[PDB]
Every structure is written in C-alpha cells, then in structure tokens.
C-alpha cells in the first residue's frame, strides 16, 4: 500500500490542479489531456457501496491496475463495473495469491509478476 499510494496521490493532485479545462479539452496538448483523463478515471475509481469492505489484496489489485495503463481503455462511465468484475475474477482463480497478500503484505518482484499476469489474462479473456 505504501508503494502504490503515491500514484493515486499524484493523480488526484493533478486533477485538482486542472479541472476547469474539461470543456476545453481539445485545445490542450496531449500530456495535459492525458493527465485530465487519468484524473477522471482515478476520481471515479474511489466510489464504493455500503456494507462491502475491500481487502488489502483487493485494494492492491485495483491500485496496480490504475497506476499502470490498464484503465485507459474503459469508458469513464463504466469504471465501477470494470473494477468489481476484476475483483471477482480474482478470489476464484487466484485465491492462493490473494491469501498470501492478505497474510503477509510483502511486495517482491514475484508478486508483481503474478498480479500483472492475472490482470492481462482478465483483460484478454473475460468481459465486463
């Protein structure tokens, strides 16, 4: 969590910096437009329902999928549906890994590889 919180903090800060440019998006350069889109995706990722606590593994997977470019193809309105589907794909096919993350909390190159492979498999095969 300590490793992965920085990207979200930076994205939220940059979205706070430039938000009135939403109407004038086409007039901006590519970098600022990409920053604005990433900020919109991140700020819609933060929405959650009552009586559904997320686990450490769930938060880690969601944040890793966001910090990397995986959530750059989904529409701004469909982010909430994509996030749960991704969570439910895990805990059913990758439960050992979820248990290891929950019980240990470590972060080594091996875990990162497993998370990346699982996200790639979900994006390739399943649909949301």
């Amino acid at each position: 969590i300590k490793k992965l919180s920085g990207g979200i903090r930076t994205a939220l800060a940059q979205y706070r910096e430039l938000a009135a440019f939403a109407q004038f998006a086409s007039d901006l350069d590519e970098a600022t437009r990409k920053q604005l889109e990433h900020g919109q995706r991140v700020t819609e990722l933060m929405k959650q329902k009552q009586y559904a606590p997320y686990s450490i593994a769930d938060q880690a997977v969601s944040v890793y999928a966001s910090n990397e470019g995986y959530m750059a193809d989904v529409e701004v309105k469909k982010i909430v549906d994509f996030d749960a589907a991704l969570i439910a794909y895990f805990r059913s096919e990758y439960a050992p890994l979820m248990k290891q993350i929950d019980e240990t909390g470590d972060y080594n190159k091996d875990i990162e590889a497993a998370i990346k492979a699982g996200i790639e498999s979900f994006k390739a095969t399943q649909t949301y």
């Binding site: 430039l18 009135a20 440019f21 004038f24 007039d27 901006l28």
Partner: protein
C-alpha cells in the same frame, strides 16, 4: 449580511476565478496558434505582391478595369467581427470607427452599401438598418476560402456593374499582444504605391504571355481579390 451568505459567496467567486483563469490560458494558446498561422500565411501575401509588381512592370501599357478609378459615388464597405463576446468591445470600436467614417461620407452626400462577415454585426449592428449585399456568419476559427468566396464576389460584382465605385475593408490590426487597433483600407481601387522594385535589376524580359497577352491577367486580380481579404480576416481572429 448573514455570515452564511458571505461564506457561500466567497467560494462561488473562487470557482468563477478558476474558470476565468482557465479561459485566459486557453485564449493564450489559441492566440499563439493564430500567430503561427499568420506567420505561415505571410509568404503567400509576399509572393502575391511580388508577382503583381512583376506583371504590372512587365505590361504597364495595358491596365485592367480594376486599376482605373472613376469619380467616387455609391461607395461600399466590408466588415468583419467576432461571433462571441467577452472581447472587451473591439467590435464596438470597429463599428464606431466605421460609423463616423460613413457619417463623413454622408456629409459628402454619397449613399453607401456594405456587407458583413461577423455575427455580431448582423445581430446587433443590423437592428439599426443599412443597405446590405451579403452576410455570412459562423465561419469559425481557421475559416476556409469556400466559406468566404461568395461574400467577397457579390460585393465586388456590384463594382463590376458600376453601381458601386469604392470598396473599403475594416478590420482590426495586431501590433502587440496587448495592442490591437481598427484599420480601414481601400482595396478595389488598387492604386499603385511601391513600383520601384525589380526595375533596377534586369527583369526586362517580362513574359512571352503565350496563353493570353493581355487577357488572362484579370483572373490573377480575382485571386489577389480573394487573397488580401482572407489575409485580413485571420488577422481579426488573432486580435479577438
């Protein structure tokens, strides 16, 4: 007033300030892009001036109908304006300058007609009234020739039929990022000013003029006619 009212008003003003700052930055970017377009388009005007000077020095014996001036009567005008506001009233300045100009012309006892390209001129300046040949609006930024080709043509065909003699164009000129000023300039009379170039250094061969010795050049003028006005229009946009 109530503390709650002031507390909400402060936040509202802060949000409006942020929005206005965003608009200012967007305007700066658009202005610099318009400056790039102006720099890109300048060589076209330069080569047009060069070629027209070369041709007029080549065949000064013959002159077309656009280089001959008859006594001034029934003069005409061309106006360009923005389609959106918040421009600090540059359109107001242009309209006022042209209205004192036309007031002086009426004091000279000559009736006038003109045409409009700006949306604000049609929406506001026309409530008062005025003889009008053409109004084309909503051309947008980076307007194309197809968009304004007809508007210039009708105004000058009025001269071609002889019912108008002098046609001016009125537009804003850009001197510095903070400095723009109205300008009125005559184009249809096309009186010569700088003809000293290319006489001192050869350029005596001129052209065999194989397709038409003294006939095709008139079409060239039309291109010049569609050039300068276009060159003017983008100017205004940048200023805006």
């Amino acid at each position: 007033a109530n503390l709650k009212e002031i507390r909400a008003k402060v936040a509202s003003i802060k949000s409006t300030q942020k929005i206005t700052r965003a608009m200012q930055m967007v305007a700066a970017s658009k202005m610099r892009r318009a400056q790039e377009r102006m720099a890109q388009g300048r060589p076209y005007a330069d080569n047009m001036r060069r070629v027209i000077a070369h041709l007029v020095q080549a065949n000064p014996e013959y002159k077309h109908r656009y280089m001959v001036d008859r006594p001034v009567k029934r003069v005409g005008y061309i106006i360009v304006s923005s389609d959106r506001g918040l421009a600090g009233g540059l359109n107001i300045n242009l309209f006022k300058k042209v209205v004192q100009h036309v007031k002086a012309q009426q004091e000279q006892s000559i009736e006038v007609q003109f045409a409009l390209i700006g949306q604000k001129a049609v929406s506001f300046f026309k409530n008062y009234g005025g003889k009008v040949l053409g109004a084309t609006t909503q051309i947008g930024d980076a307007p194309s020739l197809e968009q304004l080709t007809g508007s210039v043509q009708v105004m000058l065909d009025a001269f071609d039929k002889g019912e108008l003699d002098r046609i001016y164009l009125v537009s804003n000129g850009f001197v510095n990022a903070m400095t723009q000023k109205p300008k009125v300039e005559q184009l249809v009379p096309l009186a010569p000013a700088e003809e000293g170039d290319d006489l001192n250094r050869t350029y005596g061969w001129d052209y065999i003029y194989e397709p038409e010795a003294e006939e095709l050049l008139n079409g060239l003028l039309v291109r010049y006619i569609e050039s300068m006005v276009y060159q003017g229009v983008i100017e205004n946009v940048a200023c805006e």
